[PDB]
Amino acid sequence: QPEPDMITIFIGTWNMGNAPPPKKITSWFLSKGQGKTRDDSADYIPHDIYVIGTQEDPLSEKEWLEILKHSLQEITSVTFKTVAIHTLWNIRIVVLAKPEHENRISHICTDNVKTGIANTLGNKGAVGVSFMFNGTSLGFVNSHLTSGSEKKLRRNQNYMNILRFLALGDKKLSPFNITHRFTHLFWFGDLNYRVDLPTWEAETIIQKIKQQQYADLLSHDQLLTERREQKVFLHFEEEEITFAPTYRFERLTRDKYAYTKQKATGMKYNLPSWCDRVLWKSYPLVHVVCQSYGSTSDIMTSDHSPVFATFEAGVTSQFVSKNGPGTVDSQGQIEFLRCYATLKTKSQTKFYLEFHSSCLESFVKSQEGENEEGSEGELVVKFGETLPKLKPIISDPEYLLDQHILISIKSSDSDESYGEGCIALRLEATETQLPIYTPLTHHGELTGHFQGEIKLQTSQ
Numbered sequence: 196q197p198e199p200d201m202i203t204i205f206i207g208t209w210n211m212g213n214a215p216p217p218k219k220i221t222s223w224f225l226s227k228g229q230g231k232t233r234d235d236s237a238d239y240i241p242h243d244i245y246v247i248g249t250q251e252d253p254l255s256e257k258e259w260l261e262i263l264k265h266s267l268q269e270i271t272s273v274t275f276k277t278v279a280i281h282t283l284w285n286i287r288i289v290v291l292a293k294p295e296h297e298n299r300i301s302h303i304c305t306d307n308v309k310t311g312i313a314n315t316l317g318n319k320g321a322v323g324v325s326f327m328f329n330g331t332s333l334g335f336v337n338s339h340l341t342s343g344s345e346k347k348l349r350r351n352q353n354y355m356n357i358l359r360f361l362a363l364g365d366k367k368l369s370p371f372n373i374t375h376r377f378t379h380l381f382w383f384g385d386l387n388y389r390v391d392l393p394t395w396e397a398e399t400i401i402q403k404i405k406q407q408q409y410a411d412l413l414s415h416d417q418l419l420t421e422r423r424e425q426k427v428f429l430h431f432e433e434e435e436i437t438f439a440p441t442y443r444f445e446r447l448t449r450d451k452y453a454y455t456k457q458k459a460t461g462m463k464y465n466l467p468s469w470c471d472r473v474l475w476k477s478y479p480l481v482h483v484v485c486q487s488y489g490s491t492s493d494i495m496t497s498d499h500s501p502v503f504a505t506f507e508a509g510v511t512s513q514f515v516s517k518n519g520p521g522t523v524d525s526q527g528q529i530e531f532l533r534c535y536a537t538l539k540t541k542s543q544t545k546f547y548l549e550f551h552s553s554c555l556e557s558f559v560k561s562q563e564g565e566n567e568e569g570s571e572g573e574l575v576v577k578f579g580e581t582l583p584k585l586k587p588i589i590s591d592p593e594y595l596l597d598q599h600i601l602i603s604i605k606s607s608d609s610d611e612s613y614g615e616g617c618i619a620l621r622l623e624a625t626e627t628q629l630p631i632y633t634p635l636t637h638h639g640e641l642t643g644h645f646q647g648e649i650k651l652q653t654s655q
């Protein structure tokens with residue numbers, strides 16, 4: 196039985212509005228309704244992994260697991276295995292996988308983050324799951340961010356608290372937050388960003404939705420605009436939205452948007468919005484293709500409609516050679532030429548690099564770089580030809596070209612990371628000097644850049 200080099204992943208997000216679901220929710224898992232939908236000819240083909248995020252979920256874990264498993268069995272005739280389930284308050288994540296994957300999945304982590312302080316601590320935050328699928332790390336975050344059209348900044352703050360404090364993936368990657376720990380990271384949920392138009396325009400907005408004319412609405416979607424201004428979700432992707440706003444509906448129909456201010460809304464308007472979203476971030480030059488992104492039309496117990504997204508995701512096998520794991524392969528090396536970090540920091544300390552990768556026996560610390568002043572005020576940290584030669588565990592190019600090097604630039608004075616990034620070893624050539632580049636972030640904000648050249652030697 197050959198190991199896969201691709202899997203398909205289903206991501207679902209549904210704010211259930213504290214109501215039990217209807218008896219049939221199969222349309223969600225089939226990616227049927229509005230938007231980019233799945234072909235009917237695929238209906239019996241199971242995805243490899245289903246990741247279900249709920250918000251305002253009134254069910255016990257047992258209740259929801261029984262509905263999910265029975266739903267997938269009806270669709271596919273496959274009895275899925277439970278990989279992980281984690282609930283914070285009414286925010287839940289479930290990971291289900293095909294039984295054949297049971298012994299491909301390992302290192303299962305779960306965590307949660309509670310957002311806000313005092314007043315604003317008590318129902319919003321995130322849950323997450325991570326695991327290894329053979330040689331590939333996968334992370335999944337389901338967040339319920341702060342509500343309300345005038346709280347986009349709070350949402351952005353919630354995002355930064357979640358990516359700082361959610362503890363998933365390999366703890367040895369200590370300088371790296373979840374935005375660097377995974378081959379593929381999927382972040383979804385009731386992100387609660389709104390279409391930011393005047394209240395008086397409510398009926399105009401509804402008209403536009405009935406005409407399936409989303410362009411003038413998406414140009415005011417706070418998540419798109421905040422992302423464009425680099426305020427949130429830097430270096431994530433989202434598929435084009437081609438489905439109607441998923442909030443706020445009258446229950447038991449989808450024919451009416453309930454937008455008017457009510458005591459029950461704290462006297463806030465809920466103009467039709469794309470609250471419910473799926474985004475991802477994959478390491479450079481790894482295969483990831485969104486094959487569906489849409490909302491169901493026939494599940495109406497909540498004031499939100501479920502959202503689905505599906506992906507093709509490249510995966511690698513758990514490689515064993517005669518040498519590594521358990522030693523180096525002398526036929527492999529990674530060299531760096533003419534490298535320098537450009538940092539936004541106003542500080543003057545010395546910096547060194549750390550190289551982390553599962554292709555190394557352990558992380559590698561460089562010597563300190565040489566600080567110079569950039570022509571436009573910047574700190575430039577020059578490594579020149581001084582960076583160490585990295586010794587991979589396996590030299591076979593079928594392994595090494597699929598690997599990635601995480602880089603942290605750290606202060607000598609404090610050992611704190613000022614910036615993190617990632618370099619793919621999927622090069623155009625081996626034994627050849629080639630440009631490399633990564634942006635550097637810290638707490639998911641841009642802090643600088645790392646650039647230079649790489650020279651990769653494999654056993655071919």
Ligand SMILES: CC(C)NCc1ccc(N(C)C)cc1
Pocket residue numbers: 419422423431
């Ligand atoms: C250079 C390339 C990777 N940038 C892709 C890219 C990423 C995000 C956005 N927006 C508008 C949020 C636009 C483009």
